From a paper:
RAF kinases are essential effectors of RAS, but how RAS binding initiates the conformational changes needed for autoinhibited RAF monomers to form active dimers has remained unclear. In quiescent cells, members of the RAF kinase family localize to the cytosol as inactive monomers, maintained in an autoinhibited state through intramolecular interactions between the RAF regulatory and catalytic domains and by the binding of a 14-3-3 dimer to two phosphorylation-dependent serine sites (pS365 and pS729 in BRAF). In response to signaling events and RAS activation, RAF interacts directly with GTP-bound RAS at the plasma membrane, which ultimately disrupts the autoinhibited state and promotes RAF dimerization and kinase activation. Here, we present cryo-electron microscopy structures of full-length BRAF complexes derived from mammalian cells: autoinhibited, monomeric BRAF:14-3-32:MEK and BRAF:14-3-32 complexes, and an inhibitor-bound, dimeric BRAF2:14-3-32 complex, at 3.7, 4.1, and 3.9 Å resolution, respectively.
Analysis of the gel filtration fractions obtained from serum-depleted cells indicated a well-defined peak of monomeric BRAF that was comprised of two distinct physiological complexes, a larger complex containing 14-3-3 proteins and MEK (fraction 18) and a smaller complex containing 14-3-3 proteins but lacking MEK (fraction 19). Only one of the autoinhibited complexes included MEK, but both contained a bound 14-3-3 dimer, and in both structures, the kinase domain was in a canonical inactive configuration and lacked ATP. Except for the presence or absence of MEK, the overall conformation of the monomeric BRAF structures aligned well, with a Cα RMSD of 0.95 Å for the corresponding BRAF:14-3-32 portions and a Cα RMSD of 0.99 Å for the BRAF KDs. In these structures, the BRAF monomer exhibits an autoinhibited conformation with a 14-3-3 dimer bound to the canonical pS365 and pS729 sites and the CRD making stabilizing contacts with the C-lobe of the kinase domain and with both protomers of the 14-3-3 dimer. These results are consistent with the previously determined BRAF:14-3-32:MEK1S218A,S222A structure; however, they show that BRAF can exist in the autoinhibited state in the absence of MEK. In contrast, the RBD is well-defined in our autoinhibited BRAF:14-3-32:MEK and BRAF:14-3-32 structures, revealing the position and orientation of this critical domain. In our autoinhibited BRAF complexes, the RAS-binding surface of the RBD faces away from the CRD and is oriented towards a space that we term the “RAS pocket”. The position and orientation of the RBD in the context of the autoinhibited BRAF complexes indicates that the RBD is accessible for RAS binding, with key basic residues involved in RAS contact exposed. Nonetheless, both the purified BRAF:14-3-32:MEK and BRAF:14-3-32 complexes were fully competent to bind GTP-bound KRAS in fluorescence polarization assays and displayed high-affinity binding.
Author numbering:
A (entry chain C): 2 to 69, 73 to 230
B (entry chain A): 156 to 201, 204 to 227, 235 to 272, 360 to 370, 449 to 738
C (entry chain B): 2 to 69, 72 to 133, 137 to 230
The structure:
């Protein structure tokens, strides 16, 4: 069935174990119907934590790799052991976001988030590669936001959380990955201020996500300016 | 021999020989209630020179000791939303503990952040059916009546009109009109031509103070967290538009038949500190239990500066996790004012219930901290609760076997 | 390669990737060397998290299980079964390991208590997930053998003794329904330490007070 996959996803979410849900949700992407918003963030959170679990795995081991000769090799081999795991899972979802749900869709904002994920996960793969191995991915990611970002500044109000979500993520995309703070600074201030003048109507679309990301812009800028 | 003024309203005679220092002599008696020479502090009378733990007690015979209270770091990756607890930013990785519940900072390069996951009113006379007044309270008098149904009118104390003061209300009522929310009561309107009987919605259900001391009925503590969350969220939205409650009490709070809490009967900092001109310099009112130490001092020109309501929330947490008010042993209104504002007295936290998580007992260590510079704004206080509102089936056992520190300083 | 199995486990220790310490250290215990204090500890840290995190995963699935058509229940019930089998297989992995090479080659008196303490410990998780009487009595007998060796060899101011006292005591309250046995066990172990607190070492001061703290925090909790 379909709701049994959906229901099991929620139950797996309960018990701190999302790897089980990710394999259950990865099947949901491979169904063929129209994904809906409520479980859409379940798709977002599922691989984000699954990758984040491996991201946190890679980020710490990278530290001790540089904090060091056979012992260095142990770190060197293990680090690549998880990067392949980190890359394979990202390629698993990059296949999801490419051939499965982008084609079938009819609401611009629904397309905005998935395109954000396409830029997201390609960017995630871009964190591990080096030199030539990432240029084909980074360029693919940049287009995923640029396609969505142009839909952002045009087709949706600045109050909606995803546009700020597309804004904060896209901005940091410039600072760390692309190493272009000037476009990040300009976009961050623009996205935040164009969204600070229309904060009158919040409760109709949860105020929670707004102020977090809104705050997450200024403090990030506080770091991005120092 | 030396004395000890233990928390939890206790005192125990203890010996003190020669040679042995502060640490062991007291620790042999400190431990029986769950202390340690590195989580407590005592002072001597000189006026409080800090007497530490290494010092020798050969010159401390016939002395008095007020033992006033001042982790192991496992790792994790916070799947749900969870904020830091050293700078109150957003936290993804980092340390923790199995008992305390307190996150810790990790950069003290410094990686950036990302997007966290998710899931006018004119009223003329004619429909004003005012009944018996309930009673006094924080800023004045309240009237149960009828306006478009069972809706609570509210007549202020100083109803003396001022043509500019109505404009001030238009400044304070327009802001406090459209802010609807799941918890906050749906405000209706204001009595215009008759004296101001504010049309705020009335319903059924028992109050919180009514639910704990007039009847004094408690439940399973799973519902206790529900109260400390929704009131953290309902009053969070009020600080989302800077609209301070200014009168948070266990009285006005409602309960919607074990479904959800409801907060209301708030605001109007204009009638409070009434216009004696064009000024609205403030004053204390009601009782000083909910109200904050830096509002007691009478020197806070803007007392509700986004943190004096945090302390008011904590005085609701203490009423939630103790079944009793603060200071049931000191029962004089005028004198408790002197000893709370200057910092001589803080609520005795070592009497809280025994079957509550250490994390919320840490929440009261900050949500009731006398200073206003390290109160966690309701953004952080809101998020913390869902962390240990879904973490009930995880630490419900008896303090079993924990691991080692797993972290090196 | 045993030291190669070391670095692959200490590294996996700070990665939230613990199933790599299940593989690594399980392959150290089945070699035939001497289990020093360090690798002895990592075995406890590794499996406890692997089984405890999966144990705690079961508890959350249990709370929602009891909070109720039968379609919703059977799905929650099925997930309860799936983690259940993973719990036993990830605990019987330790239980079979305990028979093969751990205990029969125990080298030190304090050492064998540590493993004998774990024996009953890992049965307890298996005992409380459960066909029933056989598992629970073995736990107690494994605990009782730990009890026998503890009082006559284990010092009364040691984390393992207190931890064994702690676990064995919390065993009584939750499974054996004997709080009076537990509080008596807690008080007896706690009090002697208070007499012996004047003599300890900085290498034993840290973990000892934490157990007593929890043990005393355990003392106060069960009083009512
Ligand atoms: Zn921090």
């Amino acid at each position: 069935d379909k709701n049994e996959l959906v229901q099991k996803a929620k139950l797996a979410e309960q018990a701190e174990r999302y790897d089980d849900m990710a394999a259950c949700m990865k099947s949901v992407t491979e169904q063929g119907a129209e994904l809906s918003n409520e479980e859409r963030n379940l798709l977002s959170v599922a691989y984000k934590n699954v990758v984040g679990a491996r991201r946190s795995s890679w980020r710490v081991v990278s530290s001790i790799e540089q904090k060091t000769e056979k012992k260095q090799q142990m770190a060197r081999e293990y680090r690549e052991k998880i990067e392949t795991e980190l890359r394979d899972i990202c390629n698993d979802v990059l296949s999801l976001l490419e051939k499965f749900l982008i084609p079938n869709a009819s609401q611009a904002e629904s397309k905005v988030f998935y395109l954000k994920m396409k830029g997201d996960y390609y960017r995630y793969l871009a964190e591990v590669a080096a030199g030539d191995d990432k240029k084909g991915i980074v360029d693919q990611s940049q287009q995923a936001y640029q396609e969505a970002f142009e839909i952002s500044k045009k087709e949706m109000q600045p109050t909606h959380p995803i546009r700020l979500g597309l804004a904060l993520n896209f901005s940091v995309f410039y600072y760390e990955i692309l190493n272009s703070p000037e476009k990040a600074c300009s976009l961050a201030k623009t996205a935040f201020d164009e969204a600070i003048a229309e904060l009158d109507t919040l409760s109709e679309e949860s105020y929670k996500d707004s102020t977090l990301i809104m705050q997450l812009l200024r403090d990030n800028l506080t770091l991005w300016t120092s | 021999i030396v004395r000890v003024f233990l928390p939890n309203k206790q005192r125990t005679v203890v010996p003190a020989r020669c040679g042995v220092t502060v640490r062991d002599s007291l620790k042999k008696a400190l431990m029986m209630r769950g202390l340690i020479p590195e989580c407590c502090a005592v002072y001597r009378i000189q006026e409080k020179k800090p007497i530490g733990w290494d010092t020798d007690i050969s010159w401390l015979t016939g002395e008095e000791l007020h033992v006033e209270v001042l982790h192991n770091f496992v790792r994790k990756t916070f799947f749900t939303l969870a904020f830091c607890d050293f700078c109150r930013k957003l936290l993804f990785q980092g340390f923790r503990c199995q008992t305390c519940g307190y996150k810790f900072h990790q950069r003290c390069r410094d990686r950036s952040s990302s997007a966290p996951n998710v899931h006018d009113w004119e009223i003329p006379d004619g429909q004003i059916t005012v009944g018996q007044r309930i009673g006094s309270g924080s800023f004045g008098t309240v009237y149960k009546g009828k306006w478009h149904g069972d809706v609570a009118v509210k007549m202020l104390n100083v109803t003396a009109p001022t043509p500019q003061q109505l404009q001030a209300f238009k400044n304070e009522v327009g802001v406090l009109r459209k802010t609807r929310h799941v918890n906050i009561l749906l405000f209706m309107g204001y009595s215009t031509k008759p004296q101001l009987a504010i049309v705020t919605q009335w319903c059924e259900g028992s109050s919180l103070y009514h639910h704990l001391h007039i009847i004094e009925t408690k439940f399973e503590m799973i519902k206790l967290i529900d109260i400390a969350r929704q009131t953290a969220q309902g009053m969070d939205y009020l600080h989302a538009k800077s609209i301070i409650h200014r009168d948070l009490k266990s009285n006005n709070i409602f309960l919607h038949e074990d479904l959800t809490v409801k907060i209301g009967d708030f605001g109007l900092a204009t009638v409070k500190s009434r216009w004696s001109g064009s000024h609205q310099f403030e004053q204390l009112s009601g009782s000083i239990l909910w109200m904050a130490p830096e509002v007691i001092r009478m020197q806070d020109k803007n007392p509700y500066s986004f943190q004096s309501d945090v302390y008011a929330f904590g005085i609701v947490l203490y009423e939630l996790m103790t079944g009793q008010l603060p200071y049931s042993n000191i029962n004089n209104r005028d004198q408790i004012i002197f000893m709370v504002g200057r910092g001589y007295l803080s609520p005795d936290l070592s009497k809280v219930r025994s079957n509550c998580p250490k994390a919320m007992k840490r929440l009261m260590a900050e949500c009731l901290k006398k200073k206003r510079d390290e109160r966690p704004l309701f953004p952080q206080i809101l998020a913390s609760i869902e962390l240990l509102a879904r973490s009930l089936p995880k630490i419900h056992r008896s303090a079993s076997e924990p691991s080692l520190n797993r972290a090196g300083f």
